[PDB]
Design an enzyme around this catalytic site. Structure first.
Site, short mmCIF file in Angstrom:
data_model
loop_
_atom_site.label_atom_id
_atom_site.label_comp_id
_atom_site.label_asym_id
_atom_site.label_seq_id
_atom_site.Cartn_x
_atom_site.Cartn_y
_atom_site.Cartn_z
N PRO A 197 60.11 78.46 49.06
CA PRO A 197 60.20 77.59 47.89
C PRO A 197 59.18 77.94 46.81
O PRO A 197 58.12 78.50 47.09
CB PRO A 197 59.92 76.20 48.46
CG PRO A 197 59.08 76.46 49.65
CD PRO A 197 59.57 77.75 50.23
N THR A 246 56.18 80.00 48.17
CA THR A 246 54.76 79.56 48.33
C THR A 246 54.64 78.54 49.45
O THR A 246 54.65 77.33 49.20
CB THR A 246 54.21 78.95 47.03
N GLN A 247 54.51 79.02 50.69
CA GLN A 247 54.38 78.12 51.82
C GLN A 247 53.11 77.30 51.73
O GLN A 247 53.11 76.10 52.03
CB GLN A 247 54.42 78.92 53.13
N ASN A 248 52.01 77.92 51.33
CA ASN A 248 50.71 77.25 51.22
C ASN A 248 50.22 77.33 49.78
O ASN A 248 49.64 78.36 49.37
CB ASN A 248 49.69 77.89 52.16
N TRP A 285 56.69 76.15 44.82
CA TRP A 285 56.00 74.87 44.94
C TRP A 285 55.64 74.36 43.55
O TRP A 285 54.51 74.48 43.07
CB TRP A 285 54.76 75.02 45.82
CG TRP A 285 54.42 73.79 46.57
CD1 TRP A 285 53.89 72.64 46.07
CD2 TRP A 285 54.59 73.57 47.97
NE1 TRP A 285 53.72 71.72 47.07
CE2 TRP A 285 54.14 72.27 48.25
CE3 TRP A 285 55.08 74.36 49.02
CZ2 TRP A 285 54.16 71.74 49.54
CZ3 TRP A 285 55.10 73.83 50.29
CH2 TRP A 285 54.64 72.53 50.54
#
Lengths: 73, 212, 233, 212, 239, 86, 232, 247, 233, 229
Positions: free
Chosen positions: D105, D1-3, D107
């Site tokens: 990752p 989950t980058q964002n 998050w």
């Protein structure tokens, strides 16, 4: 016991273990165990069959060739 | 998204004639906060070897687990526990395996060698290692190292006999240097864990420092 | 005659002859016994040397800090299985930081060993094992055969002339649960002796012992370290 | 989950004599918007473990699914062995570390509580693989607002009772509600004891004094 | 020689390898299963080859999922492999679709997996038959059986193994439609004790499991008290 | 090995020899040699003496015999394709 | 792809495929090689000139590199494949070690290739035996042999193919420091050895000579005829 | 499965590749293919084995293929394998031209195809290509060339050779009628006509059972032609008249 | 028919036993382990006088403290020797130490028996190696001698003879060997046995001798030393 | 996961037995005929279904490939379907690459190369079908045959299937070079009539034509109108 009740048998001859080490054996082969148990007791001059005579004679009736089966384990 | 974070910690190691001390603080931090107060950086590998890891905590845990696993594989394959030199060489190999995504870990291996003497190995994050009589790493390495050089190394001093190190003197020096480092460095000073390595075994000591 | 050539051909009687041949291969190995009490598990093995000047083949091998194995059969396949066991235990410790229960390890062994028994050109692992270990559920003893089958046994012997040992264990099975470690090892050594062919006796050069207990990581006794146990039989 | 898209706020935790207690508000924020207001951020791993969460809620649901499937697989065998809180903590740490290394990752910032073998557990797991065990834990903004009160109380009194722990958690939740812009009045409390895991309904910080 | 591989047809149109696999399961101890209004009950005649095996060793009853049981007959290795495959299928279904796998779907999937092994010379037919049992409020009690050929059928009562015919004859007198699991446990114990042959088999241990409303939809081993009661009932029956 | 070293003796008795002949060495040069292949070596080694016109054989004569009956005629043989009993 | 065990053990411990490869080698044209003091000579018997074939396209003697050449007996196609492999390996060695290949290195490479083929899956053993000659950087003359099984030995002089035994006996009886005293003596030795096997004589022998620094030289028919006349 | 494997890449007890030998035996039943090399060109004469009143005339030849601007080949054996190998030859030549910007020498092309054939007869488990090819071409290194190939992967340069039915008779006749280094293209064509006449025992040549192709150099560019019916008939008439004059 | 991985009715892998029989065609090799060191000897078995004995390398060095004597199919041993050398150097590179003899033998044995026909590897081996190797060297445990066969079984041997004259060479070694022997006596006895078994008269150009000692490293006896030893015979 | 060894191998006398057996299977197939006229081509076959239940129009034997090429077969139907699919795919690939309809000769070569692969590849048997390709490219008709072996020939008139030798003799006796398409259709129908064993109807046979307009399978009404003679 049917084919062995004519020659000699020490009281300490466990047929139960004998009947367990002999698997996939047809009835006729079972008699050969008792018959060969004597011929191999005659080799070592004696009058009484012993358990190690039956066990040792089981191999002779199994008819398995020697293969130097000694690099295992 | 930054894959790294600095969690502080200060490692120390002194090598003696018949012993080896590996010391460390017990503070885990993240930025300006404190995570825990009872997280030592000293890890026991064998009965005659101790490793101290400081930097990014996740890499510390993964590296320690990998080292223990590899120690067990070596024991099984070669039917003998590894020596400090073997651990040092293996760690140098492991660190370089991740050269292009390096572990953010500073390692100091302290233990006894085959002859029965003390041996301390320093490491860089990528794998550069060398034998040294004493080394300090982590947040307060710059503060600790000069004192060890001056006292243990008898450097920049003249007309002073080179008396060999004693275990009591080594312990006192470790406590003093870590108190001094705590007084100045923000990331250290919670509590001190000392891992002494000798022929008899490994003994652990704990000393309280200032929570500020 | 034509149905005993591959592991993917069923016989008209419903048997896979290759698996039977692998079982025979294991039976051709040297003797070994395994017991357990309320607090310990013991493996005693009889080693045999090809020549008078050759060292006796080792049979008991380490797997983890709480699992051991006694091999009986082809040695290379035994090493392959031991390596698989070691890797599985290491992975369990690495991921869960917890010893792998013996039962799960034996299940993994069965899954690994069944695969050859169903695909063309493969052969069964010609090795039988006696796994001993201590977990949260207490001492454990397991038996694995070339056919991908495992049995949870309270006492069992495999290898050449093992039937005598099995008979002895069945006769004296009522007192294994509540005996000290020395008595349990003595029982195992007595079974191993019952396996021997009359004109021969247990010696320090042909007997190996492995013990795992509640407060005793797996250890192997060999050479002069087995003298304390033999003195008393 | 980058964002991350839907996020959760702090998760509190404190261990008392006989177990641990976890707390978390029921709120999924879409970046300064109380979008979802009836979502539970606590999960029951098994009879001796519960897990809170923060950060992305979708990642929390994915972890819920995976961990539930592992628990089901363990329960199927019926061999008498059950995952311990430490085992779940280690597995979560390894999963997060692997995802971080792959640069994908999860998050999340998870808190694991449990009570097995007459001993309490309370752990931390960040998206970067940092993991530690301490008497009291607070993720997100709790590390700045709620953690000090817990630490003071615990330093004064190392071992707490269930009533005291619940009162402390309630007070910390009230403080977070006062000083956190992403918090919600409704929250849950999870307690683990020898009787298992119990999750309390949607409690409210009714004690909201507003003397201007 | 037309019976050396599963990829060759007999001139009369049979796959002999599958027949040999079927014969393999016919040489194993019987394992029956009965479906009732409340749920399903499974029983296995576990032969004790020797007194050296721990009671419960070589268990032939598995829990593929928390709501699906499994009783096997034949080669135990293949049975365990297929149990693992069923576990994997159930887990995948739950992960993808988000709810417990229906029993019919799981039976069909596992049967198709078995069937895929009865077409090529690179693999051999599975030497094992097994039955799956599940209970849900929406779906109700269900019981299925899968043979080496990959045939899946739903049964009100089925037996697999040596004494399949005798077990089927004895099951037919049970009017199982309007009974509960409590009576079915005792009936299963009696049936297993009737079919067992003392002359051939030395001794045996009775293994039971059930899944129904009484168990809240969870497959679990029967409590030891109920097992003992059923065993006593079986002994009393053979007076 | 002990066997085929004895087959050589039972077939090389009624023949002229150098007396000092390493029969054991000849036995180990034909490992999987049937009993017949050993008589053909003895019956052929003396054949190499009838051709040279000598009347007493020699070890070098036997070695040439092994090179012909064991390693030179091994193309046909029967042992390799029969020990499988098929 | 194909993964059948082509080469498998037989009772009595034989690799029957290797034996058949040797039998195939025995059916090829004869070859000879002699190691001189300052010259290495390789000869080959031509089965039939045919009076229409182009002798350039049937050469059994080929140069792997500047300081190594070989002659093969057996199957031509397998020989060509092995030659190409050896040439590429020689150039790779020149690139890497920056020095010319040694005869031992290249013969070992060929032996390893043949062993890999005789122990691989879905592969038939190479049916060729090779004589490799050349001069090492030290200047010492060398001669090596290779067999399908993958075994290589250094010989003073060997012969492979039909008549290998006869030429071997001739060389063993008639090899001495006197015979290798001069280059012409070595060439005469090779021709005389071949004449014990070849029937027509003279026109059915192809001789290739390599010296210390000079590259490979293939004797023209006139030179071979002159040598044959001198032998008589 | 082992049982159904034909084991096409084994060595027979006498060290013979049986599949290669059988493939060669197959070639003996194909059409007769002949090639003569002259001081000013090369020619290929082939037996048009297919002969029927219903077959239509398509393409520029039935067995003589073009591979480059300065190469051509003739095939005897199985036609499908011939097509596969012709395509591979064209691809190899174009690859060489792309890499070096110069036409591929004939020896290199024959070597590449023979490497393919050898690979098929060593490893893979597949049947060998049952086709023998005759090549003719010009290059700046050795001038005109005539090459031969066999399923085993063996190639040799020839001045006059024949592959196909009654190959031995053609080779013997050429051995007696070939004047090395003193043959023009006209004499080569006459010799080819004689060889085809005697080798095809079935009646006499009808000018429809012969496909003759020529390779010659003109104005710095290679020219490959397939003789028409008129010139073939003229050659037949000249040969018949010469034979009558001799007798 | 009868693929590579097929079990005989007695439970013995067919290919392994066929390979074992192939060892009996090799040249005799003798290895004696002594407290002072370990010695390796082998017959070169020259075919023709033209062949240069120097080119027959039946004894090879793996590292400065490990040497190996070969017997059987020489070609098959090259890959195993290369693997042993690579493994030794890899161990040195990683752990900055010297791999023990047992570890090298174990790795080489693990390499053996990894042969298959279907679903093995892109270039896996088709048949087992037909070589029996004698590993000898000095390690932390003192001099060691190890014997490995195609089956992958390796045993430490005080004195082991392999090859055609194995039966009889072993009997002689049992006759002469004693624990307190010295390296010179070991060399003399090995030479006497090799002379007795060898077909041709023993000399310096048809035998190879190597010794490994705690102080010195792998030394291959040159011509002069060999003649000095043979002087007394 | 698939046999990697060829099932077709050279017999001692040098013949490929599998290909010969495939040709025998073709000879056992249904009759087919193709006549090349001066202004088009014609293909004809037989479709005597085993009974009246079979739907005559359900499946077709004279199947188009492109707007100017069509083919017919004699042998195993499923193999013909596979070959038709492959031929259509090859034609479309050629069209995409070159932006022009595939010439009949080129499609013949590609289909033949496809057939050859199955007589050498591993774990496969030769296609048991022979094709007759018709097309109109470059202002001239084209007729081709392709056998299981992968060999293709150019024909002015040909016949396959049962009694194909007799049909070829018939064609040799009756063919003329300067025919028209209609006379070619009549000749083809008559040739089919030589070995039919029954009453010929619109549904019993199939006819296809290829002229400047393109390829198209004749409708039953047109076949009946031609059948009047």
């Amino acid at each position: 016991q049917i084919h062995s009740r004519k020659m000699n048998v020490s009281p300490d001859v466990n047929y139960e273990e004998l009947a367990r080490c002999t698997d996939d054996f047809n009835g006729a082969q079972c008699k050969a165990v008792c018959v060969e148990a004597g011929m191999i007791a005659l080799r070592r001059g004696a009058t009484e069959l012993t358990h190690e005579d039956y066990m040792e004679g089981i191999l002779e009736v199994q008819a398995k060739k020697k293969a130097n089966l000694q690099y295992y384990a | 998204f930054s894959p790294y974070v600095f969690n502080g910690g200060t490692i120390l190691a002194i090598a003696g004639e018949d012993f080896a001390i590996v010391a460390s603080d017990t503070r885990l931090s993240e930025g300006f906060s404190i995570h825990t107060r009872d997280s030592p950086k000293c890890y026991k590998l064998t009965d005659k070897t101790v490793i101290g890891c400081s930097g990014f905590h996740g890499d510390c845990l993964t590296l320690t687990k990998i080292i223990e696993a590899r120690l067990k594989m070596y024991k099984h394959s070669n039917n003998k526990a590894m020596t400090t030199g073997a651990i040092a060489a293996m760690l140098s190999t492991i660190l370089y395996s991740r050269r292009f995504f390096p572990y953010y870990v500073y390692n100091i291996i302290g233990g006894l060698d085959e002859e029965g003497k003390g041996a301390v190995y320093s490491f860089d994050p990528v794998g550069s290692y060398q034998r040294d009589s004493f080394k300090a790493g982590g947040s307060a390495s710059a503060m600790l190292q000069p004192l060890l050089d001056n006292q243990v190394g008898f450097k920049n001093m003249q007309n002073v006999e080179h008396v060999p190190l004693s275990l009591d003197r080594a312990m006192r020096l470790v406590k003093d240097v870590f108190i001094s480092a705590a007084e100045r460095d923000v990331y250290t000073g919670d509590a001190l864990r000392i891992c002494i390595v000798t022929k008899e075994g490994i003994r652990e000591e704990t000393v309280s420092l200032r929570k500020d | 005659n034509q149905y005993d050539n591959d592991v993917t051909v069923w016989s008209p009687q419903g048997r896979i002859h290759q698996i039977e041949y692998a079982m025979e291969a294991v039976k051709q190995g040297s003797a070994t016994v395994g017991l357990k009490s309320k607090t310990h598990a013991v493996l005693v093995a009889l080693k045999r040397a090809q020549s008078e000047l050759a060292a006796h083949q080792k049979k008991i091998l380490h797997v983890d800090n709480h699992i051991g194995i006694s091999i009986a059969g082809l040695t290379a396949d035994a090493r392959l299985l031991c390596n698989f066991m070691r890797q599985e235990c290491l992975d369990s410790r690495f991921v869960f930081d917890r010893p792998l229960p013996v039962s799960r390890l034996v299940s993994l062994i069965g899954s690994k060993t069944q695969i050859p028994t169903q695909r063309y050109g493969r052969r069964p692992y010609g090795v039988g094992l006696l796994i001993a270990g201590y977990d949260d559920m207490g001492p454990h003893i397991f038996q694995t055969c070339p056919s991908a089958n495992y049995f949870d046994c309270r006492a069992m012997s495999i290898g050449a002339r093992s039937q005598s040992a099995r008979t002895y264990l069945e006769r004296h099975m009522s007192e294994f649960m509540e005996c000290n470690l020395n008595e349990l090892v003595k029982h195992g050594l007595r079974a191993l002796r019952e396996t021997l062919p009359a004109e021969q006796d247990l010696t320090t050069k042909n007997v190996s012992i492995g013990i795992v207990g509640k407060d005793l990581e797996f250890t192997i006794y060999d050479d002069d370290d087995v003298s304390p146990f033999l003195e008393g039989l | 989950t980058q964002n991350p898209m839907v996020t959760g706020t702090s998760v509190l935790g404190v261990k008392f004599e006989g177990g641990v207690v976890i707390a978390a508000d029921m709120l999924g924020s879409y970046g300064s918007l109380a979008r979802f207001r009836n979502i539970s951020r606590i999960m029951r791993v098994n009879n001796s473990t519960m897990l809170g969460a923060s950060g992305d809620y979708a990642d929390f649901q994915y972890l819920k699914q995976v961990l539930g499937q592992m628990v089901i697989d363990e329960e199927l065998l019926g061999d008498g062995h059950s995952y311990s809180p430490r085992a779940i903590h280690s597995w979560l740490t390894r999963a997060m570390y692997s995802r971080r290394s792959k640069m994908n990752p999860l998050w999340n910032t998870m808190v694991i509580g449990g009570y097995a073998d007459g001993e309490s557990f309370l752990g931390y797991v960040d998206m970067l693989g940092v993991a530690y065990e301490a008497p009291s834990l607070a993720t997100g903004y709790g590390a700045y607002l709620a953690q000090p009160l817990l630490r003071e109380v615990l330093e004064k009194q190392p071992v707490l009772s269930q009533t005291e722990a619940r009162d402390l958690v309630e007070r910390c939740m009230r403080v977070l509600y006062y000083r956190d812009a992403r918090s919600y009045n409704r929250f849950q409390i999870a307690t683990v004891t020898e009787k298992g895991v119990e999750i309390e309904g949607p409690l409210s910080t009714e004690t909201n004094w507003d003397i201007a | 020689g037309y019976d050396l591989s599963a990829s060759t047809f007999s001139p009369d149109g049979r796959v002999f390898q599958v027949e040999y696999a079927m014969k393999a399961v016919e040489n194993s101890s019987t394992a029956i299963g009965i479906r009732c209004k409340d749920g399903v009950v499974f029983g296995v005649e576990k032969l004790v080859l020797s007194k050296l095996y721990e009671e419960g060793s070589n268990k032939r009853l598995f829990n593929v999922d928390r709501h699906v049981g499994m009783a096997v007959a034949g080669l135990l290795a293949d049975a365990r492999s297929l149990a693992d495959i069923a576990r994997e299928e159930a887990s995948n279904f739950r992960s993808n679709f988000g709810y417990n796998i229906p029993l019919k779907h799981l039976a069909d999937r596992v049967a198709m997996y078995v069937h895929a092994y009865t077409l090529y010379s690179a693999v051999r037919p599975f030497g094992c038959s097994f039955m799956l049992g599940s209970y849900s409020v929406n779906d109700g009690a269900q019981l299925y059986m899968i043979d080496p050929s990959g045939v899946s059928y739903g049964y009100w009562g089925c037996a697999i193994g040596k004494a399949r015919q005798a077990a089927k004859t004895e099951i037919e007198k049970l009017q199982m439609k309007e009974m509960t699991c409590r009576d079915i446990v005792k009936e299963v114990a009696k049936i297993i004790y009737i079919v067992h042959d003392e002359v051939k088999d030395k001794a045996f241990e009775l293994e039971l499991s059930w899944v129904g409303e009484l168990t809240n939809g969870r497959h679990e081993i029967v409590p030891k008290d109920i097992r003992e009661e059923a065993e006593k009932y079986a002994k009393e029956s053979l007076k | 090995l002990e066997g085929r070293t004895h087959i050589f003796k039972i077939h090389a008795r009624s023949m002229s020899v150098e007396r000092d002949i390493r029969f054991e060495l000849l036995a180990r040069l034909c490992p999987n040699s049937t009993g017949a292949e050993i008589r053909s070596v003895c019956t052929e080694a003396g054949m190499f003496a009838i051709r040279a016109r000598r009347k007493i054989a020699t070890e070098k004569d036997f070695l040439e015999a092994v090179n012909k009956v064991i390693k030179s005629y091994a193309k046909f043989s029967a042992t390799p394709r029969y020990m499988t009993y098929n | 792809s194909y993964d059948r065990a082509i080469t498998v053990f037989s009772p009595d411990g034989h690799l029957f495929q290797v034996e058949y490869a040797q039998e195939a080698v025995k059916k090829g044209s004869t070859a000879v090689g002699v190691r001189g003091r300052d010259i290495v000579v390789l000869g080959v018997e031509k089965k039939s000139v045919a009076k229409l074939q182009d002798e350039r396209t049937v050469r059994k003697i080929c140069a792997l590199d500047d300081n190594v050449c070989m002659a093969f007996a057996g199957l031509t196609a397998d020989a060509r494949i092995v030659i190409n492999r050896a040439r590429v390996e020689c150039q790779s060695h020149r690139l890497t070690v920056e020095d010319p290949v040694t005869v031992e290195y290249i013969t070992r490479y060929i032996a390893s290739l043949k062993q890999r083929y005789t122990q691989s899956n879905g592969r038939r053993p190479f049916g060729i035996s090779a004589l490799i000659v050349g001069f090492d950087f030290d200047g010492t003359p060398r001669l090596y042999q290779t067999d399908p099984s993958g075994t290589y030995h250094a010989w003073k002089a060997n012969a492979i193919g039909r008549g290998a035994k006869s030429v071997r006996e001739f060389l063993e009886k008639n090899y001495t420091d006197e015979a290798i005293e001069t280059d012409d003596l070595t060439i005469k030795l090779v021709i005389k050895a071949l004449l014990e096997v070849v029937q027509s004589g003279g026109k059915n022998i192809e001789l290739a000579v390599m010296r210390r620094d000079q590259s490979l030289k293939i004797l023209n028919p006139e030179e071979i005829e002159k040598y044959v006349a001198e032998i008589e | 499965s082992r049982r159904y494997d034909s084991r096409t890449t084994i060595f027979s007890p006498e060290g013979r590749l049986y599949q290669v030998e059988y493939a060669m035996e197959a070639i003996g039943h194909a059409g007769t293919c002949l090639g003569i090399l002259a001081n000013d060109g090369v020619l290929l004469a082939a037996e048009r084995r297919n002969i029927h009143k219903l077959l239509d005339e398509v393409f520029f030849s039935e067995k003589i293929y073009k591979l480059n601007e300065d190469m051509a080949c003739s095939v005897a054996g199985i036609t499908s394998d011939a097509n596969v190998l012709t395509n591979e030859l064209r691809l190899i030549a174009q690859r060489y031209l792309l890499q070096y910007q110069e036409p591929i020498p004939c020896e290199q092309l024959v070597t590449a195809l023979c490497d393919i054939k050898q690979a098929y007869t060593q490893f893979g488990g597949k049947r060998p290509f049952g086709v023998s090819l005759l090549y003719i071409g010009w290059d700046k290194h050795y001038g005109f060339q005539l090459y031969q190939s066999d399923p085993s992967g063996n190639y040799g340069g020839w001045k006059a050779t024949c592959i196909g039915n009654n190959s031995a008779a053609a080779v013997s006749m050429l051995k007696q009628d070939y004047k090395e280094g003193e043959m023009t293209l006209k004499s080569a064509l006459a010799l080819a006509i004689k060889v085809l006449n005697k080798t095809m025992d079935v009646s006499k040549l009808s000018a429809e059972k012969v496909e003759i192709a020529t390779l010659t150099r003109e104005n710095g560019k290679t020219v490959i032609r397939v003789l028409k019916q008129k010139e073939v008939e003229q050659l037949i008439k000249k040969h018949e008249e010469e034979e009558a004059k001799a007798e | 028919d009868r693929g590579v991985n097929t079990f005989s009715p007695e439970g013995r892998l067919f290919q392994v036993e066929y390979a074992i029989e192939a060892i009996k065609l090799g040249s005799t090799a003798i290895g004696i382990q002594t407290s002072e060191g370990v010695c390796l000897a082998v017959e070169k078995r020259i075919t023709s006088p033209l062949m240069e004995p120097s080119s027959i390398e039946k004894i090879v060095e793996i590292d400065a403290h490990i040497g190996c004597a070969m017997s059987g199919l020489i070609a098959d041993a090259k890959t195993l020797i290369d693997k042993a050398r690579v493994e030794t150097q890899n161990h040195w590179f990683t752990y900055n130490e010297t791999m023990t003899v047992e570890s090298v033998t174990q790795a080489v044995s693990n390499l053996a028996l990894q042969f298959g026909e279907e679903d093995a590897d892109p270039g896996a081996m088709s048949r087992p190696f037909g070589v029996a190797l004698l590993f000898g060297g000095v390690d932390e445990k003192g001099p060691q001698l190890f014997h490995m066969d195609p089956s992958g079984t390796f045993v430490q041997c005080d004195a082991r003879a392999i090859g055609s004259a194995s039966e009889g060479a072993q009997s002689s070694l049992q006759e002469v060997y004693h624990k307190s022997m010295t390296l010179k006596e070991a060399i003399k006895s090995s030479l006497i046995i090799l002379k007795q078994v060898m077909e041709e008269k023993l000399n310096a150009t048809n035998i190879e001798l190597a010794t490994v000692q705690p102080g010195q490293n792998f030394h291959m006896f040159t011509k002069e030393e060999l003649e000095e030893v043979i002087k007394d015979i | 996961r698939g046999y990697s060894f060829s099932l077709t191998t050279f017999s001692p006398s040098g013949k490929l037995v599998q290909i010969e057996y495939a040709l025998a299977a073709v000879a056992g197939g249904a009759p087919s005929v193709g006549i090349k006229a001066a202004n088009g081509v014609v293909l004809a076959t037989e479709k005597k279904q085993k009974s009246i239940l079979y739907d005559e129009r359900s499946v077709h034997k004279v199947e188009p490939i492109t707007k100017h090429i069509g083919l017919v077969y004699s042998g195993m139907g499923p193999d013909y379907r596979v070959l038709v699919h492959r031929a259509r795919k090859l034609a479309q690939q050629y069209y995409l690459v070159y932006q022009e309809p595939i010439p009949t000769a080129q499609l013949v070569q590609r289909v033949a190369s496809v057939m050859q692969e199955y007589t050498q590849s591993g774990g496969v048997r030769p296609f048991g079908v022979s094709l007759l390709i018709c097309g109109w490219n470059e202002g001239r008709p084209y007729l081709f045959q392709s056998d299981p072996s992968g060999a293709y020939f150019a024909w002015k008139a040909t016949a396959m299937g049962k009694n194909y030798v007799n049909g070829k003799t018939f064609l040799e006796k009756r063919y003329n070079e300067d025919l028209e398409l209609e006379d070619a259709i009549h000749t083809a129908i008559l040739t089919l009539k030589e070995s039919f064993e029954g009453q010929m109807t619109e549904d019993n046979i199939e006819v296809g034509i290829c002229n400047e307009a393109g390829f198209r399978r004749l409708t039953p009404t047109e076949v009946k109108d031609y059948l009047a003679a």
